[PDB]
Scaffold this active site. Structure first.
Site, PDB file in Angstrom:
ATOM      1  N   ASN A 138       0.782  -1.213   0.000  1.00 25.62           N
ATOM      2  CA  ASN A 138       0.000   0.000   0.000  1.00 25.62           C
ATOM      3  C   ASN A 138       0.807   1.253   0.000  1.00 25.62           C
ATOM      4  OD1 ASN A 138       0.839  -0.623   2.445  1.00 25.62           O
ATOM      5  ND2 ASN A 138      -1.158  -0.617   3.434  1.00 25.62           N
ATOM      6  N   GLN A 139       2.107   1.110  -0.016  1.00 22.34           N
ATOM      7  CA  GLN A 139       3.017   2.232   0.030  1.00 22.34           C
ATOM      8  C   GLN A 139       2.833   3.068  -1.210  1.00 22.34           C
ATOM      9  OE1 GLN A 139       3.133  -0.912   0.699  1.00 22.34           O
ATOM     10  NE2 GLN A 139       5.191  -1.530   1.340  1.00 22.34           N
ATOM     11  N   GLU A 140       2.777   4.383  -1.006  1.00 23.11           N
ATOM     12  CA  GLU A 140       2.404   5.343  -2.039  1.00 23.11           C
ATOM     13  C   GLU A 140       1.052   5.006  -2.637  1.00 23.11           C
ATOM     14  OE1 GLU A 140       5.422   5.092  -1.123  1.00 23.11           O
ATOM     15  OE2 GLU A 140       6.199   7.126  -1.287  1.00 23.11           O
ATOM     16  N   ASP A 141       0.056   5.051  -1.764  1.00 20.91           N
ATOM     17  CA  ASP A 141      -1.357   5.134  -2.091  1.00 20.91           C
ATOM     18  C   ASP A 141      -1.892   3.888  -2.759  1.00 20.91           C
ATOM     19  OD1 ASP A 141      -0.814   7.633  -1.202  1.00 20.91           O
ATOM     20  OD2 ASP A 141      -0.757   8.520  -3.208  1.00 20.91           O
ATOM     21  N   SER A 142      -1.151   2.797  -2.760  1.00 13.37           N
ATOM     22  CA  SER A 142      -1.764   1.596  -3.263  1.00 13.37           C
ATOM     23  C   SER A 142      -2.686   1.006  -2.204  1.00 13.37           C
ATOM     24  CB  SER A 142      -0.704   0.605  -3.686  1.00 13.37           C
ATOM     25  OG  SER A 142      -1.329  -0.420  -4.395  1.00 13.37           O
TER      26      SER A 142
END
Ligand SMILES: [Zn+2]
Ligand SMILES: [Zn+2]
Ligand SMILES: [Zn+2]
Ligand SMILES: [Zn+2]
Lengths: 147, 56, 56, 44, 49, 49, 66, 56, 279, 53, 53
Positions: free
Chosen positions: A1-5
């Site tokens: 989920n890093q950077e808006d995933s």
């Protein structure tokens, strides 16, 4: 989920969270270039046309249309068109028979694969044969979709 | 500026991206569809004859 | 440069035309050709040329 | 049975010019008769 | 096993956007070819480069 | 006093229809003194939109 | 649209409960939070669907096709 | 592309489930969050170009 | 010479070769053999997807007006200086007649098909001693009627004469010579919906009119010297079969037709009621 | 199908109705089955009828 | 057909589950975010009284 995933539950996808329909239409009609005899919506066979595609025209019918409710893959044609020209020496010159095709058929978009739903035909403003089809697709969420 | 200095090319692909903490830096993950579309020639040697035969 | 550039070469008298690979008929891909812009202009040029010379 | 045209279930069975304006209706738009051919689905 | 830190949790309202990946994936190796400039054509739908 | 008013009808009907279909705000004379984005196509992805 | 089958989070069947939850609010004059409690949905992941699902199906249904 | 990075080479591991896939550390040279961005691929076609691409 | 190329696989040769097009690859392959034939095909549909010379002829049409990146006085200078070659070609007369028939057809609110058919009809003859002038009204009206009729839009001679009076005689001779010219170079039932449109009646009288017209056509009684009149009195007896006040005194000036002819048709169908009603 | 409701809704919402499965061990996978195309010894068949009465 | 819950949520019987161990946090497998008191700001487990404080 890093950077808006996002991580998303597969099981909720399976149950039916965020499912969606998808409706696409197509528009085609006969054109008159006459000496007023126009194109035709027939079913092109092998020895009627020139340089027609490999769309495997079997899904069409005798009136040159497809039936609602059947499924279509990526490369299936849906509309059959034929050149009414004259003057081209239309079945007597610069082509064999291969009668008068110069086929102007409309294939489906090369990727998606839905089901033909609600095909209608009615004349246009001035009176022609004028066709609209519609195809319907299910679009389950996948990896790349954006919320 | 649109046909000499820069241009369309071939052998290319374009998708969207997502993170992964199971690929080290020099690696990139490619879909099987893209790797089935793209290609790359190889010259047949004594060394790779069997592998290329199998792969054909 | 006399071997490459002369002021009397700098006035148009005899005009080259480019072959159709420069100015292709787009072959309109419904039934017709829709033949293109540069050739339209050249047809204009030759029409005005013959008009001038007959008038002369 | 080949065309629909309307809220009426007028099975026109059209060949050519059999009052496309169907007799019980008024319509002239001629909708086209979902097939009898057997269709497959997949309830994954 | 228990996680150490307790976390936030709850319902929230989302909506699904139209930019789906199946319309943006695109690749080409040796396809069709333009006429005026003899280059790979444009168009993701037109199998361009 | 009759035959020309029908082509008159064609002119004003054609003019209004052309202006609204195109968005250029002027008669069929290649859009002098005109504006472009005047008659966009209705956006219908979502009732709110 | 109908009520979903099968709450996306949990999995418990929902859809038997819909018209029951309606007539809990028609004649019984009951508060809806207690209505879902008496309907028996004690987790809240299940509870959100009945409480937020809208019924467009009848608004579709008031056409006259064929 | 603005500076010397953002043309970087990679080795390829083929993965399923169509999208690209890359390590999180290389994210900021590309200057690309996963909000819906998109990259480009470029397959080399010969030994010289493969070698100089891998070595630079 | 003929300069012509036919593709042929140089390793199969068994026919005019059964080959296919791999359009997404721009290549042609001998489908029986599998060897590529030629590569880098050229587009055939995106060129049409990107966006009448035959009616306008070999000479190339030019709609020239005014632009945006120049002064208004220079646009006026352009309009004054653009009219220096309007007499060398006969195309000036071609688009003059084209503009005239454009005015006439779109004044008669006709379809684009009818407009193009009239354009073709004028373009086909366009210059003969058989034409011989005729005030350009005879030939334009004849070409319009021929094109509109062959587009299966039948219009009445009274309406053609009301739009353009061509004294009904030179119009006829011109129609005959156009008939002969097109014959060398090589629908009464359709009139009824326009009249019931002008009277405002539903579909069932139209269907009854079609049935009665075909049946009275089948048997006897041509009865009337251009039996469009008895075709009309078919509607008259249909509306007497119904009970809607569309009196013949109104109908005569509604259709610019004689009431005595209406009553004569009423009589000749009075004695012939027998087989004209379907249900 | 004639209804307002869409066909793959009918499929998907069918697919989620729970079924009686006490005796599930008696039969075997379609997978592993010696037959082809849903014999009684690997599968079961369901039928629905509706009417706008 | 047969099917199992691993490849689709159709074939689930499960529908929910619950799980808890050491409701009193004697094993110290967590510590409580708080601002005045862990004890005051968190509700007691329902399964507290099954084991001694
Ligand atoms: Zn109807
Ligand atoms: Zn739940
Ligand atoms: Zn071959
Ligand atoms: Zn079996």
């Amino acid at each position: 989920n890093q950077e808006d995933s996002m991580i998303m539950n597969q099981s909720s996808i399976d149950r039916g969270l965020f499912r969606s329909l998808f409706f696409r239409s197509y528009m085609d009609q006969e054109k008159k270039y006459g000496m007023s005899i126009t194109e035709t919506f027939e079913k092109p066979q092998r020895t009627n046309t020139l340089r027609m595609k490999h769309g495997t025209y079997d899904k069409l019918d005798d009136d040159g249309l497809i039936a609602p409710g059947v499924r279509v893959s990526g490369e299936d044609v849906i509309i059959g068109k034929t050149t009414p020209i004259s003057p081209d020496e239309e079945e007597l010159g610069q082509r064999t028979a291969y009668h008068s095709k110069r086929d102007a058929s409309t294939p489906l978009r090369s990727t998606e694969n839905g089901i033909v739903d609600q095909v209608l035909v009615t004349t246009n403003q001035d009176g022609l044969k004028f066709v609209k089809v519609r195809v319907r697709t299910t679009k389950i969420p996948q990896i790349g979709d954006k919320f | 500026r649109g046909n000499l200095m820069g241009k369309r090319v071939d052998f290319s692909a374009r998708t969207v991206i997502s993170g992964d903490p199971n690929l080290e830096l020099d690696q990139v993950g490619v879909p099987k569809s893209i790797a089935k579309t793209l290609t790359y020639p190889e010259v047949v040697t004594p060394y790779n004859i069997d592998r290329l035969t199998q792969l054909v | 440069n006399e071997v490459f550039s002369r002021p009397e070469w700098m006035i148009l008298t005899c005009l080259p035309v480019p072959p159709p690979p420069v100015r292709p008929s787009i072959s309109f891909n419904e039934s017709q050709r829709g033949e293109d812009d540069l050739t339209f202009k050249l047809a204009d040029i030759l029409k005005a040329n013959i008009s001038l010379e007959t008038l002369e | 049975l080949k065309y629909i045209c309307a809220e009426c279930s007028s099975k026109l069975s059209l060949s050519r010019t059999d009052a496309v304006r169907c007799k019980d209706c008024g319509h002239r738009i001629l909708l086209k008769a979902r097939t009898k051919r057997l269709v497959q689905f997949e309830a994954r | 096993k228990k996680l150490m830190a307790q976390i936030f949790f709850g319902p929230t309202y989302y909506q699904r956007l139209r930019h789906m990946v199946d319309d943006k994936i695109h690749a080409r190796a040796r396809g069709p070819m333009q006429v005026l400039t003899r280059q790979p054509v444009e168009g993701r739908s037109r199998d361009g480069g | 006093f009759n035959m020309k008013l029908a082509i008159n009808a064609k002119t004003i009907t054609s003019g209004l229809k052309y202006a609204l279909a195109t968005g250029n705000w002027g008669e069929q004379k290649k859009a002098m003194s005109s504006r472009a984005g005047v008659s966009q196509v209705l956006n219908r992805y979502t009732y709110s939109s | 649209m109908i009520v979903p089958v099968r709450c996306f989070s949990c999995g418990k069947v929902v859809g038997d409960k819909w018209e029951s939850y309606l007539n809990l609010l028609q004649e019984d004059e009951l508060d809806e939070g207690t209505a879902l409690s008496r309907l028996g949905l004690k987790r809240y992941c299940c509870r959100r669907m009945i409480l937020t699902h809208v019924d467009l199906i009848e608004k579709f249904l008031r056409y006259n096709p064929l | 592309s603005l500076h010397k990075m953002s043309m970087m080479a990679h080795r390829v591991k083929v993965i399923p489930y169509s999208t690209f896939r890359l390590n999180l550390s290389v994210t900021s040279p590309y200057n690309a969050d996963f909000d819906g961005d998109e990259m480009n691929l470029h397959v080399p076609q010969s030994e010289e170009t493969r070698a100089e691409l891998s070595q630079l | 010479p003929n300069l012509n190329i036919v593709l042929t696989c140089p390793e199969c040769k068994v026919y005019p070769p059964k080959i296919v097009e791999r359009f997404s690859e721009g290549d042609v392959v001998c489908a029986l053999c599998g060897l590529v034939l030629s590569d880098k095909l050229v587009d055939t549909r995106s060129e049409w997807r990107t966006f009448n010379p035959l009616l306008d002829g070999n000479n190339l049409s030019t709609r020239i007006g005014k632009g945006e990146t120049t002064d208004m006085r220079f646009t006026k200078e352009l309009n004054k200086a653009q009219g220096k070659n309007v007499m060398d070609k006969k195309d000036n007369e071609v688009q003059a007649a084209f503009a005239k028939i454009t005015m006439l057809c779109d004044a008669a609110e006709l379809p684009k098909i009818v407009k193009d058919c009239a354009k073709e009809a004028y373009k086909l003859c366009h210059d003969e001693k058989t034409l011989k002038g005729k005030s350009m009204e005879s030939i334009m009206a004849a070409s319009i009627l021929i094109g509109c009729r062959r587009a299966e839009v039948a219009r009445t001679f009274k309406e053609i004469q009301s739009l353009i009076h061509v004294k009904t005689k030179e119009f006829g001779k011109t129609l005959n010579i156009m008939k002969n010219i097109l014959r060398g170079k090589s629908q009464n039932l359709t009139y009824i919906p326009r009249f019931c449109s002008h009277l405002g009646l539903p579909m069932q009288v139209t269907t009854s009119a079609e049935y009665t017209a075909k049946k009275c056509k089948e048997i006897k009684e041509i009865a009337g010297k251009s039996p469009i009149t008895i075709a009309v009195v078919s509607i008259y007896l249909n509306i007497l079969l119904f009970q809607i006040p569309i009196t013949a005194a109104k109908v005569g000036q509604t259709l610019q037709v004689t009431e005595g002819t209406i009553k004569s048709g009423y009589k000749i169908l009075y004695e012939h009621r027998d087989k004209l009603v379907d249900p | 199908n004639t209804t307002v409701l869409a066909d793959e809704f009918i499929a998907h919402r069918l697919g989620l109705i729970p079924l009686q499965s006490m005796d599930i061990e008696q039969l075997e996978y379609s997978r592993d089955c010696f037959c082809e195309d849903h014999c009684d010894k690997c599968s079961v068949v369901l039928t629905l009828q509706a009417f706008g009465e | 057909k047969k099917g199992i819950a691993k490849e689709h949520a159709k074939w689930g019987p499960a529908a929910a589950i619950e799980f808890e161990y050491d409701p009193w946090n004697k094993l110290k497998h967590t510590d409580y975010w708080y601002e005045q008191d862990s004890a005051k700001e968190w509700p007691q487990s329902k399964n507290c009284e099954y084991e001694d404080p």
